[PDB]
Design a protein around this ligand. Structure first.
Ligand SMILES: [Mg+2]
Ligand SMILES: [Mg+2]
Ligand SMILES: [Mg+2]
Ligand SMILES: [Mg+2]
Ligand SMILES: [Mg+2]
Ligand SMILES: [Mg+2]
Ligand SMILES: [Mg+2]
Ligand SMILES: [Mg+2]
Ligand SMILES: [Mg+2]
Ligand SMILES: [Mg+2]
Ligand SMILES: [Mg+2]
Ligand SMILES: [Mg+2]
Ligand SMILES: [Mg+2]
Ligand SMILES: [Mg+2]
Lengths: 103, 48, 109, 118, 142
RNA sequence: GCUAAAACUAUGUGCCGAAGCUGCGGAUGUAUACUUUGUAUACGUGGUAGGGGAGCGUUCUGUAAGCCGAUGAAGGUGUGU
RNA sequence: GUGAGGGGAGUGAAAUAGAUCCUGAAACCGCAUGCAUACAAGCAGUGGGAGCACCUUCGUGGUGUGACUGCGUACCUUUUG
């Protein structure tokens, strides 16, 4: 059985016991997060495609923690124009473990 | 307080002298503010 | 457990010596000695001298048996170069490089 | 005093560029003048490709959804319209994943889209 | 990541047989190229070959519209000075129909090693018989 | 490669399409509010010649008869952060 | 070869401290191991991505390599360019 949820301006297809990384959230470590807006639920042969959302479907997850992705370098150079600029970046993320899916 | 390593001047009393021709990042690299060619770009390029 | 012999300062270019070194790399001591004996190259004499020194070391210092020894490792390295001047036409002068090489031979069972 | 030798700092700065130029061919990984240019161009390429990647992956998802829809007897352009008129908001990435890994669910989505179209 | 590309080891290649009698060359070639590249499968991957084998029979019966039978000309160049060789569709379809289909589908396939790999899966025969009965191809109309 | 077009004319539904706009996360300049003073709101942040602001490293002088160092300093070469 | 050079032994805290002898970077030149490479056309990278070798806390892990694929004509000066 799998479900479709929304987080951080993006959609994710998840199953029970899956660990994933999403845009940074304000929840604390060890907290429980409930997604009550489930677009799709599929269980073997029962398929629910909520028009905006599936009524009654809920997905529960646990917040493992927060972290930063690997560094990325930004480079800009305009040849023959005496212009150079650079900058680093590290994106924040929150780690979630899917603990429950219910239709 | 009152130690040879605990004395500082007032804020804004000191500034760093401009150093020309030391890279792009400084903002005054290469031509060093003199522009491109001409009399005034040369050494002692001002008119009387 | 491979014993070494090193010949330093040989008056020949490493490029030339390495052809002879490749000819014998990996082969047994007796076959390599035959090849060096019947080669007509100048580097063959130097490689023979180094290989025989290595075999003598293997026998005298480590009590190894020559019958079971093979050329396990061999390579040549560039050495200090002499500098000379060659006169040319119309007064122009040319630099001349006289190259040197080091020969390392290792024999083991 | 105020006489400064520059060897240590210059060597460190050159070594950083050489280390960043690992894996390049010939002089591009050995000679500092050549290596320095290689790193800047690589940075520019990466800056452009971080934008190109989204376009490429969107195109891939659209292709897979089109294949699934035509297998179910409909076109991609009409399936998108049917889903929008059915008020489904599943995105192209999820639709492509479903098309690749679960034919029955994608068939159900296609049926819903065509029903909304009718 | 979550979007998975097809693994070449896991690809299956089916075999289809197509009769070209009384069909338009270009509109047949588009479908042939599509099936050779694998766009029809939901596991399409631009850097992997996921197509099927296509056998074409009765190739010399392929048709063209208008006056193209006499007016469509095929060119090649030997790298010798002034070495330009020039022919016509009427003669080419009588001589080497396989060349007709090969040019038509090559023009539509990608130009590279992967395109060369894809084009090898097309088998063209003038007659109504083919030597691949062992592969048990299925009838396909396109 | 294309001919009741994959051409031209007219009409109508969809769709693709950019670093444009929207969504989510982060940084920064100005102005306005708090005086619970670095926290919010609003608008901005392509750039040559130039102007303005803020910083990182290197050698020496005092702080230093101090602090580290043969249980290993400077220098050289890798790894992690 | 009573050569040059080296291998043992011995001295020395240390002998890749052995006499053009403190440390010992780079260009440049060898050897060994892993992977790739002899049907394919271009500033040599970048965004993807299969397979292989080793390590492995046996993984949505780490380190090497990079079949196939989208995009892509160096830098500095001087110029309307
Ligand atoms: Mg400026
Ligand atoms: Mg000038
Ligand atoms: Mg002027
Ligand atoms: Mg003057
Ligand atoms: Mg004379
Ligand atoms: Mg190197
Ligand atoms: Mg976009
Ligand atoms: Mg914008
Ligand atoms: Mg700006
Ligand atoms: Mg030394
Ligand atoms: Mg090959
Ligand atoms: Mg070929
Ligand atoms: Mg100008
Ligand atoms: Mg001109």
């Amino acid at each position: 059985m799998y479900a479709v949820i929304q987080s951080g301006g993006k959609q994710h297809r998840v199953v029970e016991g899956e660990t994933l990384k999403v845009e940074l959230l304000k929840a604390e470590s060890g907290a429980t997060i409930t997604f009550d807006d489930v677009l799709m639920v599929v269980n073997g042969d029962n398929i629910q495609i909520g028009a905006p959302v599936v009524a009654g479907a809920k997905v529960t997850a646990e917040v493992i923690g927060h972290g930063r992705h690997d560094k990325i370098r930004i480079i800009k150079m305009r040849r023959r124009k005496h212009y150079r600029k650079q900058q680093g970046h590290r994106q924040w993320f929150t780690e979630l473990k899917i603990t429950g899916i219910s239709g | 307080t009152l130690r040879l390593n605990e004395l500082a001047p007032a804020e804004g009393a000191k500034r760093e002298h401009r150093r020309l021709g030391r890279g792009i990042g400084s903002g005054v690299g290469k031509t060093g503010g003199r522009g491109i060619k001409g009399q005034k770009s040369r050494k002692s390029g001002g008119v009387r | 457990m491979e014993v070494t012999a090193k010949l330093r300062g040989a008056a020949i270019s490493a490029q030339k010596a390495r052809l002879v070194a490749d000819l014998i790399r990996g082969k047994s001591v007796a076959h390599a000695l035959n090849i060096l004996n019947f080669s007509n190259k100048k580097a063959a004499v130097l490689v023979k001298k180094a290989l025989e020194s290595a075999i003598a070391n293997a026998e005298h210092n480590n009590s190894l048996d020559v019958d079971d020894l093979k050329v396990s490792t061999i390579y040549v390295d560039e050495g200090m170069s002499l500098k000379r001047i060659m006169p040319r036409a119309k007064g122009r002068a040319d630099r001349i490089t006289k190259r040197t090489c080091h020969i390392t031979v290792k024999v083991g069972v | 005093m105020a006489r400064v030798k520059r060897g240590v700092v210059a060597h460190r700065r050159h070594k950083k560029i050489l280390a960043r130029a690992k894996g390049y061919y010939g002089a591009r990984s050995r000679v500092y003048r050549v290596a320095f240019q290689a790193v800047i161009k690589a940075g520019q390429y990466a800056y452009r490709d971080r934008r190109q990647k989204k376009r490429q992956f969107r195109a891939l998802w659209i292709a897979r959804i089109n294949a699934g829809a035509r297998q179910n007897g409909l076109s991609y352009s009409r399936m998108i319209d049917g889903l929008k008129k059915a008020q489904v908001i599943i995105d192209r990435r999820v639709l492509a994943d479903i098309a690749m890994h679960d034919a029955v669910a994608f068939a159900a989505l296609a049926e819903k889209a065509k029903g909304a179209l009718a | 990541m979550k979007t998975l590309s097809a693994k070449p080891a896991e690809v299956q290649h089916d075999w289809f047989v197509v009769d070209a009698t009384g069909k338009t060359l270009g509109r047949l070639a588009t479908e042939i190229a599509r099936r050779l590249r694998g766009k029809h499968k939901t596991s399409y991957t631009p850097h992997v070959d996921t197509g099927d084998y296509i056998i074409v029979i009765n190739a010399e019966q392929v048709q063209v519209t208008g006056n193209k039978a006499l007016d469509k000309k095929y060119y090649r160049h030997t790298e010798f000075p002034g070495g330009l060789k020039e022919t016509n569709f009427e003669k080419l379809v009588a001589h080497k129909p396989e060349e007709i289909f090969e040019r038509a589908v090559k023009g539509m396939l990608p130009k590279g090693p992967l395109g060369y790999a894809m084009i090898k899966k097309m088998k063209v025969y003038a007659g109504s018989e083919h030597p691949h009965a062992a592969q048990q191809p299925q009838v396909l109309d396109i």
